[model samples]
Target chain A: ANTRDKIQSVALELFIERGYEKTSMREIAEGLGITKAALYYHFKAKEEILVAISQGLGGPVDELVAWARTQPRTLETKREVLRRYSEALMGAAPLFRIMQESGAALRTLGIGQTLNDRIAAIGELMYQDGASVRSQVRISDALASVHFGAFFLSAIEGDPEEKRKALLESALETLDSSA
Target chain B: ANTRDKIQSVALELFIERGYEKTSMREIAEGLGITKAALYYHFKAKEEILVAISQGLGGPVDELVAWARTQPRTLETKREVLRRYSEALMGAAPLFRIMQESGAALRTLIAAIGELMYQDGASVRSQVRISDALASVHFGAFFLSAIEGDPEEKRKALLESALETLDSSA
Candidate 1:
């Protein structure tokens, strides 16, 4: 757990400061006051660290997706997912920002890809089966709520917690308004 | 009118191709097959050309901003403003993109100040002014209308139309 925490914190710092792709595992170890051998004992390389950090974020999301897939696919369930998503997003917000800004660079990384898959899955759940163009956009906006909440909500006002609530409500409203 | 059209076409092309600072007045003249002196005659310098182009874009915005200053400040006005702004953004959208993505370097350019001012770079505008961001992002969306209309003018019109929709609807 200590090793995981160190790797996550340090890699996150490097990703934020230097951008994600530019970071190397060796540099992360150097920054961590540990040698490559010790660092390798946990994350094998930068990609592994990236996946670990991604999983740290995506792990909750994967669970959310799995939960949603089992639900009845009602508007209430859709709203609940937004609620859970907002809560889950608070922890992963920073990584999502990096993912958005440098998303092209992060294409091959499982973090963005896995998150996108979950997001699309959530969209499918939100739309159920009809998939009207409006529903399509609504579903898009549904998933967009979580992505935007974690990523671009800083552009909006209010405190972090408040922004999350506003964004979640707004995102759900987007679907409601569209419907 | 011929000179004006020629100047705008050449300036925009060179600006997009070589970048704003990297492309010089002399090169614009060369592109037009004229001397720098002749280019200077139509426009005083590079900044003047940028001012003229942005003024063309900003004229409608400044008018809308002025109108908004007098209106009831309702969501209706904001939505209407967005529609008009999006329609207005066709060609200028790319310029907006260049400014947003290359802002630091653009800031050092003489014309960039006026362009930012046109965008109403004041804090309130910076926050609530949805004009530029909406315009730029929509431009980036690759609308079918983009390919259907005149490359320069039509795209600008589509943006203005989008602004109208956004402003009126939201």
Candidate 2:
């Protein structure tokens, strides 16, 4: 299991650093201090490595989606969704960076189901039946803002923890204003 | 000027009708009742056509941004900025829709400087930068929704517009 994790981490690092189109399996093995066959033992191909990496992200998010689907559609439930999404994304920051750098490549790998698409679907479920598109976009944007903070906004200085909190705070404000 | 307008309109239609990669110079020319060579006479390549289309957009916004840089950074300037962005995007609806659907392909194109660098710039203007990144993104979504009322209004009453008129409904 530890070796499996080491492969996932190192492979993701290369994928993020070098890009999905440029990185190769042999390099991943060498980086991991393993042979090509050993790396293949865990992931059959480069696509599987991506699937594994993506599934690492999708697992928690899908669970949250499923959980939110089961709950009553209310403001509190939607707020709870943001709270949980922020939590799920905590350790997944590196993966988001990969998603950003290699988005063009990932689309070809059948990873075209974007975080935006997921948020939009989840937004539909969260809407109280008759809520407007504007309302839903507001809800979606608020939750999305936290996930998006690092891509462009790393300029304003703070500890990571403070930045995350402030992100959630601003997002919540946008949601409340729209509501 | 009329010929240039015709090319721009035909190219926009071709790009919207077919995926950017699938759409050829021949199709755009055929749509305009001209030879592909004639189209090339006006523009060097398909990418130059895209640049022309973007310049149609950027010219207005460039003037606006220049005007904006000189103004006092008041709520007025910010609101005017939203209004102007809304105008720049309204009639260019098909262009942006094409841009979004073809995002993966467009990312490969060198001119997606908006995606690569605008993200950083938009955040800085919003102050919170990272946290407010989505507000910039929502501007895209917000632009589409505003046209639901009357696209020709040009000044799209987006979420930013909602700040000006809080009582308006979707």
Candidate 3:
């Protein structure tokens, strides 16, 4: 886990600083001050490293998805899902920021598609099944706030924790208002 | 007007079916049954054609920014800004879809055009929430409409949702 985790953090840092396509495996190894073979032992390719990073960070999100799947579909359950997701997403801000800036190059890694699937799954869980289109829209709005607000509103002046709380409060209100 | 609009529609149709990179000018002309010379008479290049399409669609949004800037930054104005933006966005959805799919290619092309509804580099630097909220609305609407009913109906609902998200702060 030592070399692998170090490689990933260095790779992620380089990927964010330079676009993913521009960052080669050799450079990642160089950043870690390790030999190419050592880096290659952990990740065969740059794409693999990205996939590993995604897998590493994605554990909590996938856990939430699995947990949500088991719970009964209710307004209360959906609100709780949004809360948990907001917390889960806090760890993902750096990666999401990478996705936003490196949109074009990131598409090639297929991480965008993976994130899309996760978003769709979360959207499905958040939305009230058999609800009116308007109600569903409101629910969708709540989910959007929790996810987008947590990451994108960093420019807004406030403590990150407080901002996250305010966003969740608004998101929950929008969710309940629709119901 | 007739020929230009036809060319744009044919070009947009082909770009969607194939891709921006794959679509050729000759094919666009053939789709309209016009000669290459005639196509050249209207627009100099494929990029120019896209700029025209964007500029035509971007007028209302530019107006909205101007309108929003003039008004008080109160909830009423913000809601109205969202409403006006929602209506403005309805027309640009197709182009936005193309922008989404053709991100890499468009970024290459868009870097030159730089300052429209997409709001190039400077737009996102400081004023992030507005840009990001608008971006989230555009993308969220794009995603949800794909999963739901009639596009027009979904657009209306998305507008409502987007307004709520914006109003959450106030």
- Stretches off by above 4 angstroms in model 1 are A25-27, A101-105, A110-112, A128-139, A154-159, B1-81, B84-170
- Give, for candidate 3 chain A, the lowest lDDT window spanning 10 residues: A103-112
Q: Which stretches of candidate 2 lie over 4 Å from their true place?
A: A22-30, A33-47, A109-111, A128-137, A143-161, B1-5, B17-25, B41-52, B64-83, B103-134, B137-139, B142-170
Q: What does the interface RMSD come to for each candidate? A: 8.7, 5.4, 5.1
Instruction: Assess candidate 1 and give its TM-score to the true structure.
Output: 0.51
Per candidate, chain B TM-score? 0.54, 0.65, 0.73
Report the lDDT tens digits of candidate 1 across residue range A1-179: 98788888998899888887778877898998998899889876677766677665557777888898898967778788888877877877666656655643355463425565566576667664654443444444445545544655544444667656655655565546445
Query: lDDT values of the candidates?
Result: 0.57, 0.60, 0.68
TM-score of chain A of each: 0.73, 0.75, 0.76
Per-residue alpha-carbon lDDT of candidate 2 for residues A19-87, written as tens digits (9 for 90 to 100): 876899988999989998899999898878776776656567778888887988778888888777777
Whichever of 2 and 3 has more lDDT, that candidate is 3
DockQ of every candidate structure: 0.06, 0.23, 0.26
Estimate, for each residue in B14-92, the C-alpha lDDT of model 3 and write its tens digit.
8779877778877787888834456788898888888788777777878777666567645576567666767787777
Instruction: Please tell me how candidate 1 rates in CAPRI terms.
Output: incorrect
Residues forming the 10-long window of minimal summed lDDT in candidate 2 chain A: A150-159
**Candidate 1 interface RMSD value:** 8.7
